[PDB]
């Protein structure tokens, strides 16, 4: 989870435009300091404060992870139209040759 929060808070500081999965941090010193002043803390601070010093929040978030996979999500919702999305927990591979 952190792996994506970090990134979504970084190229949002490198002024990215396109989808998340294309952002590159290179050549953006203003996105270096924003990361550097979290690295030089070690364990001398609560991890909540350290996360605050980059993301701007205090908790695990799943929204950046979902924003990373948005194109794939739409393409899948398209490819899964003629199918059953979900599963049933009663079928089993050996249930048709069992005797009760």
């Amino acid at each position: 989870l952190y792996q994506f929060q970090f990134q979504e808070a970084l190229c949002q500081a490198a002024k990215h435009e396109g989808p998340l999965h294309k952002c590159d941090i290179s050549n953006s010193t203003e996105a270096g300091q924003k990361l550097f002043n979290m690295l030089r803390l070690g364990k001398s601070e609560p991890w909540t404060l350290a996360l605050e010093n980059v993301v701007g929040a205090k908790n695990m978030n799943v929204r950046p992870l979902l924003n990373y996979f948005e194109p794939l999500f739409t393409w899948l919702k398209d490819q899964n139209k003629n199918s059953f999305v979900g599963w049933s927990t009663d079928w089993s591979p050996y249930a048709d040759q069992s005797i009760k």
């Binding site: 970090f6 999965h21 690295l39 364990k43 909540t48 350290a50 908790n59 194109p71 899948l76 079928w91």
Partner: protein
């Protein structure tokens, strides 16, 4: 008072901790980069001479009462020493705990299964069963491997795990924890900062709450993979059921990566690989590291230090000097950072270079902290910076700039889907397995499951 005394004690501690740590790490490095029976015992001598100093200094510090200090960077270090660990256990119990741990580890390492038709060819797990489970495409062979591992080896570990939970629960309750799971969750706890607190009970709610937004995407992934496996194994997979557990790429289903060949969305368009363009431009395992360092220095972080270039093992030694080179970074102390890895000129090493150098760049940043306050903010922070450094360096907009991937290369919106699906098979495919496993273990370290 009590404060000045504690501060002086930590001061006196740091010197010896630093020096002994340096020498022990030097021993372990010299052993790792040079596998010689000479160095084994030497590394063991250094290791024990560090372990003993740690135990002694820990008991010598059990006297300072905790809830009297107000300096946070002092309470933080003291809390790391007073941690009793497994000492509080009785003597004979601690010895049986160690015996159990070593037995389980060596059963896993040396267990082996063998054919029903030729009982004189047995396979270990690492080379031989992992290979079947990763490569094969035969239903019955996969089922045989999957079942034999769990029947020949998993049945030996039942009686041992039963005793392991009891002893660990004792060790945990003798340190004012509810159970062992509550002891493990104690890495995310924050205490007394007025706005940033965090309790060991909140972690459960946070992961159960984050795992709700993932099910909508994980079940579309699941449905797509099932509809694609219903073509490689016809008649074996119900179109509305679950997926049989032995057809998931590896032995436990932890990662879904090895399903790529079966489920690639646009099978004719190729991936982005620059191995060729690297050999053609004459790249050895020394230019890739200057490239990584240049990438890092672009963003603002500092350079590398000479000792890194001198002492490092960037390349495989090749000759009789053997050295296990699972890629790693090392922070020996006092200013000696160095990586050890046998770089082959491919792409999947151009990435591990960035990963490991990100580890290093983390370490060089907090190197001005007290010896016990040199780690990630918690346990999940360290690999999560290696990951983002490795993730930003594999994008065509970067490769196009560093020289590879000749400029007239248009990325189609189909290779983008190819890449995102290769990514989601290891990131998203593994979140439910992780969640389910830790949930089960938290519940059995509570007697919640008889």
């Amino acid at each position: 008072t009590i404060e000045e005394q504690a501060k002086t004690f930590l001061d006196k501690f740091n010197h010896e901790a630093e020096d002994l740590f340096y020498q022990s790490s030097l021993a372990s490095w010299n052993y790792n980069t040079n596998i010689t029976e000479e160095n084994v015992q030497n590394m063991n001598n250094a290791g024990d001479k560090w372990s003993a100093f740690l135990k002694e200094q820990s008991t010598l510090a059990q006297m300072y009462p905790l809830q009297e200090i107000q300096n946070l960077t002092v309470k933080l270090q003291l809390q790391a020493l007073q941690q009793n660990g497994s000492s509080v256990l009785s003597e004979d119990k601690s010895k049986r705990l160690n015996t159990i741990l070593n037995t389980m580890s060596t059963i896993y390492s040396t267990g082996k299964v063998c054919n029903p038709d030729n009982p004189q060819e047995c396979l270990l797990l690492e080379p031989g069963l992992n290979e079947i489970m990763a490569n094969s495409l035969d239903y019955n062979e996969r089922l045989w491997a999957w079942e034999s591992w769990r029947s020949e080896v998993g049945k030996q570990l039942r009686p041992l795990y039963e005793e392991y939970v009891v002893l660990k629960n004792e060790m945990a309750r003798a340190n004012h924890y509810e159970d062992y799971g509550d002891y493990w969750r104690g890495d995310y706890e924050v205490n007394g900062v007025d706005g940033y607190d965090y309790s060991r009970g909140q972690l459960i709610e946070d992961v159960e709450h984050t795992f709700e937004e993932i099910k909508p995407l994980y079940e579309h992934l699941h449905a797509y993979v099932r509809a694609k496996l219903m073509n490689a194994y016809p008649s074996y997979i119900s179109p509305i059921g679950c997926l049989p557990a032995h057809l998931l790429g590896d032995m436990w289903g932890r990662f879904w990566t090895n399903l790529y060949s079966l489920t690639v969305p646009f099978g004719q368009k190729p991936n982005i690989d620059v191995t060729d363009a690297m050999v053609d431009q004459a790249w050895d395992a020394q230019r890739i590291f200057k490239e990584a360092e240049k990438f890092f220095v672009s963003v603002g972080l500092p350079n590398m230090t000479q000792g890194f270039w001198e002492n490092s093992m960037l390349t495989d030694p090749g000759n009789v000097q053997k050295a296990v080179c699972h890629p790693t970074a090392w922070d020996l102390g006092k200013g000696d950072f160095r990586i050890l890895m046998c770089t082959k000129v491919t792409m999947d090493d151009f990435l591990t270079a960035h990963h490991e150098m990100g580890h290093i760049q983390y370490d060089m940043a907090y190197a001005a902290q007290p010896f016990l306050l040199r780690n990630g903010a918690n346990e999940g922070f360290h690999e999560a910076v290696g990951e983002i450094m490795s993730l930003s360096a594999a994008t065509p907009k970067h490769l196009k700039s560093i020289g590879l991937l000749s400029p007239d290369f248009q990325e189609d919106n189909e290779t983008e889907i190819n890449f995102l699906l290769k990514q989601a098979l290891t990131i998203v495919g593994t979140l439910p397995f992780t969640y389910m496993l830790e949930k089960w273990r938290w519940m059995v370290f509570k007697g919640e499951i008889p």
